[model samples]
Target: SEVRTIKVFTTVDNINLHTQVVDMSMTYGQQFGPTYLDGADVTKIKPHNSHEGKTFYVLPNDDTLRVEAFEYYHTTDPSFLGRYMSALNHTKKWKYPQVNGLTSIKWADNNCYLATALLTLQQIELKFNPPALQDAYYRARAGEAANFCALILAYCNKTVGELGDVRETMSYLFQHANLDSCKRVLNVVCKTCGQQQTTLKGVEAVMYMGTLSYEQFKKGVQIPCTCGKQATKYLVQQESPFVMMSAPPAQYELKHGTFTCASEYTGNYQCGHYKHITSKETLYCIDGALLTKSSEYKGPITDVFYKENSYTTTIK
Candidate 1:
């Protein structure tokens, strides 16, 4: 089988670092520009890039950065590479605007926290490899991991505390299916997908239809027909007011009937009486109230009546 490669770019100050992780059937590459993490004032100790099955690495010189080339057997899985690259991109964009414009400085700070967390995770995996070091080495690495997680959590806590409802507000904004919310979600999705642009409508439809189930929608149920008396009346006429049925489709069903009426007006008062002349055939709703009878109503009578009504309305 063909081996896969993964690439990542991590930069400190004016030096660029590219990292590549190879796996089965795919290649992943991460590119870090020289200007990444400039605000943190960290100098690049290493840099690397991989191209066309070739690998290159950068070593920090006494005064400048030097690039070195090398190759090795596949070590990391493609999925892990994908995640690491995504985290790196997120961290850079969230922290450095020159690389990504999706987030503000405040968001970037959060991204920094996430980036460090992902880095800690990566380092932990490396520590578990066969290169068994001394207890002191393990302890040092463990300390580094703890420090990274602690710093991330501390910043997150501070952000939430200082902003009070900021976390809630952002959560709500990201969770919904509106244009703004979809835009925000798509921003992250497109970056992760390696696409430059994506449509909000497409993303929203996929999010709702692909991931969100009817039961999930019903999880946060509130009072029925809370939209006042008019809404309550509408609900009764439409059967259940629940957005999603509790049971499975094979367990429950819904029935519906439609009434067609003629209107008659009397006197100069413009009074009108609408009498039901015909009633639609009752339909059995099945599949946990998901499937509607009206949706499947395509009988010969319906087609004839529909055509006659269209003609009448057009002529009138």
Candidate 2:
């Protein structure tokens, strides 16, 4: 019933699509979000995307809102997560409607690593302000959206002082003005997130923690180390009553290891003292219950470990 015009262009040697020009009103979800055309209606666009026959009018900057605006709520805002928080009430799980097969669900492993980086830019917006962060994210991807992202520099001006070479990288990222560079610079200039910002999960997160690079990290390769050296095996802890091993952190029960309670040795064995007992005298978690005697010690583990390998009980 309603129609907005979009002009598509490809760069000299790119295939995946560089940008789409849309009206300013629809820029932010402020007016409307993008959606895929259905069946025959897709023909309206003609020979859609090399005849793939389908299209997802994904709001480009939507991820920004999905990543930054959960604190606020709306009905199906365009974003990396689509409806996300709005769907939380309608859906059964917290992580739902994946962004894409290659995109990650973990906030810690977000492709752009915005969970930490979006923080700085989220506080300020002039051209693409939305009710929440999701609205801004999708809008930032607009064809001309590249032009205004540096507005973030102006926004960053008061707090960030003056944009230096930090501004140069922004230029590079915007071969056509991709805002990701702005965020990448913020991740570095501000380091609101840890310096090593890589995202990985499942077998990859477990196996590649140490070897992941910023390139691979951007691709979702996920890690931990002390003093900047890759140590031989790490002592990890979990929700259960025990400690784990390796940078990935395994489960509470070991396949062949014997289970020993720290109460027998000398450390306090409560669910809270999971670390003092040493790596061998550890506990594990089995679903809703605790393994080993009991455990303790907890922190931001706001993130998750590899589910398949997380079950490595360093039990004694």
Candidate 3:
């Protein structure tokens, strides 16, 4: 029977705070937050006021800032019957029934799926290994959107804001399936003259997967070759002394100690080496270019004003 109230201040002056009571677990900033106002910046707003036992976060401008209370019953503490009475009291004023948060507690419903996903993803954020938890994650990923990772990450990003790297956390989950491994060498054989080309390494290879030439790797596509005919049978292979580890070489090479920037923001620069210390993963040092902001960083620009540096590394 835990409850918290959200006071969403619409204006910069904090006069237009919209008040609504919600479950303790439903205060994710991105999904449930004040809409970006005209003068008020969503990213620049104070992350959490913490005054009067309240938390705060910002939201995208596309959605409504409206809040309605619901008794989402998927927690453990009190018995089901014990919590129902508490939930019953809160839903007395709502239009819908309180028994199931919606009509019924069908797992197929969007509300139930979202709540289940939210809780399941929270477990993934911590230490991983449990296959039951893995099953939960897979179940959550099975339904609906191909961008399933993005859906769970919205809540994680909302919960942690700038303090956490849930993007990498999700990447680590996929890394177990060998999805995030670094295949340094990309070999493309010219179908016309039977010549082969290997041009990309860890960082550059990943960039090629993202850039214009990425289209050439897919099915029914051909890489325009130097010869008269096009190149087919593009193959991606690992570098020599192949480190068959979990963490990505490209990322492990970039990260300093524990901190890692998002892959999207990572520039077309490479340095350092992945020394395989163990079978699971290895350690690396960051000496070359680490952080480069080609675009404006969308986080808070508080007392320490953010000035985007060209190409820089954490050397000093």
Candidate 4:
């Protein structure tokens, strides 16, 4: 069994240190953490990334902070996880299963397709307390509602929430797909084999597919897109390359170490190179803009997509 701990600071100047700790193969901030109180400032005295085997929670003034315990069957039997996931499609019911972590383990159900890596839906479950722990992350600020589902599910054990269709799970995890434990699996989870096709979201992702590049495994993260719809937007860490299922593949240019896409955040859009009506495409170190003399990457460039509003490219 593996486990870890989480340390959190809150707005109300309260602290309910975890009588807990974890050092497992899986964990999180425990989802729905900050929303519990009149949150103004929530900080992590101890930082933990996803899968660090640590789950955090929305603290009710800290005193009520509670952590979870996990059994890392990662060894001996990786299928132990599959057996655990067998609960994903179970049609049975729990009046409020959120209170109950993960799902019942059935050796018979020990059939989760194996993958070096697993992309658990970002949406996690609620933290411990019921009424009190029901903190308002989105409402606390603006546009936090979208976080509700993810936050809640993040904390709940054995359950990760997701949107979109469960496309006939032909999904298969591409082994050694990448150099890390997070191997790329087929896009969808195959109900039959548990294998799913790999969804090359960013051009970079596709670039690594064949080479097994391990340069940036934790680079891509799914964020809420304009739709506010479940179709989610994949926000790549700065300058780091990434991809999205709905977005067009990015066309990378070796010289610029950049790619041209028809979409991106206005903030991310920048000018890498410039064009002057005639001279060869010049490399100007500037975000997309028209300098007093030379021009710039005509359309626009972003790490995500260029709002080509014109599924078009730039004039470099």
Candidate 5:
């Protein structure tokens, strides 16, 4: 809907004393935050490359906000131009408050590291204005969303300044983001009325399973079901723990000293006798073996170890 551009001033490829500028645009719509660079080009300002040994600042568009007009929430904030410039300009080594601030950016992995710089720039806008962080949260991808939301959720109802070191916090977040969650934690269902209720039980690992032990299951945290019944009981229902292996198991046979199986068992396998072939249902069988015939051996197809071979058919 609406677009705003922030200028990145750097001396990386400057002509004499002039600064090289890369303009980043932030667009707001039904979704929030900024988009990829105008061309989806990321090579412009990767840290330790174009931004190495140089100082830069991501400033707001003049139409939206002025450089001098921006205020820091803390006297010790690293984003203040005066403090940021001094940290990157005067320091012998760049770390902590310097790395946490925008003036000095660093690499993430070996390459494809521009995303970190972009996140750092976004943090600048966040400190300048609160909604900027929310905008970032709205536009983040799954991995980015996990990392971005982690910081926001950690400091919920608090300012972004309280997040401490941006780089370290983001690393810790991304590291731990590779975890899991559940659906029942957010909405619990009552068997009496089959009505769902939002409660704290949604996040509990065991409670979300809907199966509790007698010792802990009788917590008696009752809620009114839609039918006006006290939703206190967790009636147990027995369901097959494992689905039946009805689909014909992949067929395989040992050859020479190696093993071979249908594509379903191992991708793109061949054993001279049975090469790769596909039709309606994929199958790999020995030469002269008819796939149309039901396999003589059936029960769970398992591995065929060497020396233990002589069967007309084998399933892996």
Candidate 6:
């Protein structure tokens, strides 16, 4: 089925910032493309936030449409950084997931905000200390809670030619890390799958394996056990039978032996006419049915019998 698509228009002024918009879309795709929309020609116009801003317009189409405007100001003050961070945190709380939830919307405002914040922070740090950005990047990579440390390392390696030991750090993170803690960082903007139940039709449980910090894994979060703690990670396995019987069966007699004697007094003296004893009498019955009568019954007799008799049994 064709997915529902949404188009987001980001406008700064009247002029169209096509390049910036496309770049932003690409960034969002890298972060959330697996769950959300691909980067496409969701048109972006500029000057909306400028004094010469023009009215924003969206072409009527099957896609849901929305527009946002931000005033452009050229400032290097730390106060702007604070405001920017606040706005980013707010978007990370709400706006990010909504855009990521859209199948057609490519760029997440959160990712862009993060990238911008990182850049601004780096610049501000470098203004005083020459190697402040490098120091911070190294510290972040070395820290235990470097959620996006890889991204920072990649950026430094590509742009500033100051490459740290990213590979070794990544190897250590993968080998001796528990990503469960990172879920707290991601939970800010991700939606969790609600609990599901087993029904007569089938079990409706979702199993997730891999990086547990992702939203997919968070959807099925469960409490960690002692073994999981010892392993320094959590592994969850859940089984829900859709059509489990309410109870199991009770024990029943399988056979009964009988002896019969018949007496006749035809010749003025009581004499035993016949005496018979049956062994392995085939007297076993399922529920109340005679064992010999099972062949005459139609339908799934075994299943029926099990349902009637074995439903009460339980594993001890």
Best TM-score among the predictions, by candidate number: 3
TM-scores of the candidates in the order shown: 0.16, 0.17, 0.23, 0.18, 0.20, 0.13
Tens digits of per-residue lDDT, candidate 2, 252-272, equal 232112322111111222111
Candidate 6, residues 85-191, lDDT tens digits: the string is: 23323322222121111111112321322332222222111121113223334443233112232233322222221222222222232222222211111111112
Model 2 poorest 10 in a row by lDDT: 181-190
Cα RMSD for predicted model 2? 20.1
lDDT of 3 by residue, 1-316 (tens): 6545445433211223445343334433444444233212233243343423343323323223211111111222222222222232322222221121112112221222222223223222232242323443454434322122222333223221122232234343433322233345445566457745464433232322221222233222365777667766443443321121122223222222222122221222232121111111222211111212222223211001011112111211
Model 1 is weakest, by summed lDDT over 10 consecutive residues, at: 302-311
| Candidate 6 Cα misplacement greater than 4 A, ranges | 1-78, 87-107, 110-132, 139-316
The prediction achieving the highest lDDT against the true structure is 3
lDDT minimum window of 10 residues, candidate 5: 238-247
Give the range where candidate 4 is weakest over 10 consecutive residues by summed lDDT.
113-122
Candidates' lDDT values, in order? 0.23, 0.25, 0.28, 0.23, 0.26, 0.22
- Count of clashing pairs, candidate 3: 0
Model 1 residue 184 CA deviation (Å) reads 18
Error of 6 at 305 (Å): 73
Error of 3 at 224 (Å): 4.5
Better of 5 and 6 by TM-score: 5
Candidate 5 TM-score versus the reference:
0.20
Stronger candidate by TM-score (2 vs 3): 3
Clashing residue pair totals per candidate (backbone < 3 A): 23, 27, 0, 60, 4, 17
Residue 214 alpha-carbon offset, candidate 4, angstroms: 19
Query: TM-score of model 2 relative to the true fold?
Result: 0.17
